[PDB]
């Protein structure tokens, strides 16, 4: 039915499912359903329906790149499926296989953790991500390091993670965002989680990632950005200023203190821009690929209908 319209409203109003397999499980859901019973013509009228419902879905808040990402990957499975080509059986089966493969990202991307962090090694991360916390929790069967976590990004959603870590693990300290250059003279091995990563090799992340990565390639310490698959976005950074989320400036200035709020301009960006000239490894779901290789990995997944 048209419950997708509710879904089309659901992404419209906001209220995030954490990006933790809700966006992907849902997009796989609706694509499974529209794939299941709809109009049928042989010559990619299903694919045309995928383009229509696709561009209608991408008409949501243009930041949830996972939605269009798994949309496009469904299209590539359609193209290879016809390439080898009862097609609905093969297509829905292979989509089921992609679902089951998607069902294990946060474990296998967290197995490869003992081979990086060593004893007595002051790691450092900004913001909070499910994968970086799960990833760092499987390195609690090794020695006691520190963790320095920045309290950035008002609204500063940083701490919950310092709770969820400290009461289970290593001695974490919490620094304000405005002290990331007295620290980072006494550190090594920075990690950051990624909101989405671009074709050229860029990280679009939380609103303090830049000014931090600059410190990494100033003191020459390597920064990993642990990020799973399905978040390799095409469309190299051409579209400008729709690259973000501008939120209400109530979060940065209070509605109190009248009259000053007549003539003064408040800005609030949610994301930022990390260029590929500063990232020094990607830990990923299948391999461990470098920055400058990321290009062909994208060509491994998609097809030139990247629009």
């Amino acid at each position: 039915s048209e419950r997708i319209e509710s879904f089309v409203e659901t992404l419209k109003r906001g209220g995030g499912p954490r990006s933790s397999e809700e966006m992907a499980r849902e997009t796989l859901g609706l694509l499974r359903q529209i794939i299941t019973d709809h109009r049928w013509s042989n010559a990619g009228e299903l694919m045309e329906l995928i383009r229509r419902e696709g561009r209608r879905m991408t008409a949501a808040q243009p930041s949830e790149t996972t939605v269009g990402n798994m949309v496009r990957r469904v299209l590539k499975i359609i193209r290879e499926e016809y390439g080898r080509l009862q097609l609905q059986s093969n297509i829905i089966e292979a989509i089921n296989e992609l679902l089951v493969e998607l069902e294990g990202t946060m474990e296998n991307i967290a197995a490869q953790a003992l081979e990086h962090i060593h004893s007595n090694e002051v790691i450092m991360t900004i913001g909070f991500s499910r994968t970086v916390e799960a990833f760092l929790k499987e390195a609690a069967r090794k020695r006691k390091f520190h963790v320095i976590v920045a309290e950035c990004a008002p609204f500063c959603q940083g701490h919950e993670m310092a709770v969820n870590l400290s009461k289970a693990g290593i001695e974490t300290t919490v620094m304000t965002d405005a002290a990331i250059f007295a620290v980072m003279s006494r550190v090594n091995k920075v990690i950051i989680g990624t909101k989405t990563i671009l074709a050229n090799g860029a990280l679009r992340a939380v609103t303090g990632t830049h000014t931090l990565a600059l410190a990494a390639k100033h003191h020459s310490t390597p920064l990993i950005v642990c990020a799973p698959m399905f978040k390799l976005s095409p469309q190299f950074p051409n579209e400008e200023d729709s690259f973000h989320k501008f939120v209400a400036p109530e979060e940065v200035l209070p509605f109190t203190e009248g009259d000053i709020l007549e003539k003064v301009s408040v800005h609030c960006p949610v994301f930022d821009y990390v260029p590929p000239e500063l990232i020094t490894l990607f830990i990923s779901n299948i391999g461990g690929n470098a920055p400058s290789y990321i290009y062909r990995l994208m060509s491994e997944l998609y097809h030139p209908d990247d629009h």
């Binding site: 074709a199 050229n200 190299f236 400058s292 290009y295 062909r296």
Partner: protein
């Protein structure tokens, strides 16, 4: 054949001479005897005979269509081999090379920054194609150029660009430093690209690009699908015999940012995958 190729490029305001040489060796590859293997070696001698003249791209097309024709040894036949299928396959390949610049422009157009001051040190064809489409659908931008001293060829871009009706200034080639404080998005085309993603163009390019990644502005390059050679230098004064008389210089791939090609948009460390995908 020399008068034939010179005749082909004489009546041509576009379709670059490296390209003209391709059609020249196409027709002079058609009307010759010896439908056999070693007869192609005679064309190899013609590949030297065409290479008489400079202009590295000519040798690039030489090995290019030399490999394109040379791939017909596989799918083996006798006296009527599928290089004759690469007469129209090739014609298709020549029209494939002919329609190349349009895709480079349609990809490239978007990166202009709507209030940008594009700098260029050349007189390039495809730069003017893409930049002409850029004004022909989109915002405004200034352009600064400097003139290459042993051609003054930048002024040709000054004239033809003034026919494109956009505000141009052009300062001399000694004071590029003074230019770059007031500039962004440096764009240049290129004669050839070596196997690690480095450019060779006119004899002033590195004198800028060394100054490009000091004031942190980007530096793009753009070329068609014929500048990929197997050559590999490692220093200046290690270029081949292709030059007060130098003609081309070298820019290391630790400076060239995202480049453009007929295969699509590209990063400066994926060219090796293309050429190693081809040559072996």
């Amino acid at each position: 054949l020399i008068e034939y190729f010179k005749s082909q490029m004489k009546e041509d305001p576009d379709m670059a001479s490296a390209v003209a040489a391709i059609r020249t060796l196409l027709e002079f590859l058609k009307r010759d005897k010896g439908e056999t293997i070693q007869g192609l070696r005679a064309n190899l001698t013609s590949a030297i005979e065409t290479l008489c003249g400079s202009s590295v791209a000519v040798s690039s097309g030489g090995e290019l269509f030399l490999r394109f024709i040379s791939l017909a040894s596989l799918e083996y036949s006798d006296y009527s081999k599928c290089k004759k299928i690469m007469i129209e396959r090739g014609e298709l390949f020549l029209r494939r090379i002919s329609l190349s610049r349009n895709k480079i422009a349609d990809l490239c157009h978007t990166f202009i920054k709507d209030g940008a001051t594009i700098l260029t040190h050349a007189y390039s064809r495809v730069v003017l194609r893409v930049l002409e489409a850029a004004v022909a659908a989109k915002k405004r931008f200034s352009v600064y150029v400097t003139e290459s001293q042993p051609d003054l060829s930048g002024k040709k871009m000054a004239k033809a660009l003034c026919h494109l009706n956009v505000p141009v200034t052009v300062v001399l080639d000694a004071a590029v430093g003074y230019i770059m404080e007031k500039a962004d998005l440096v764009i240049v085309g290129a004669e050839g690209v070596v196997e690690n993603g480095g450019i060779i163009n006119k004899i002033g390019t590195n004198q800028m690009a060394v100054c490009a990644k000091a004031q942190n502005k980007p530096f793009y390059v753009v070329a068609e699908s014929f500048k990929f050679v197997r050559l590999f230098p490692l220093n200046q004064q290690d270029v081949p015999d292709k030059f007060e008389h130098p003609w081309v210089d070298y820019t290391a791939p630790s400076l060239i940012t995202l480049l453009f090609t007929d295969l699509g948009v590209l990063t400066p460390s994926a060219v090796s995958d293309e050429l190693i995908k081809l040559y072996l």
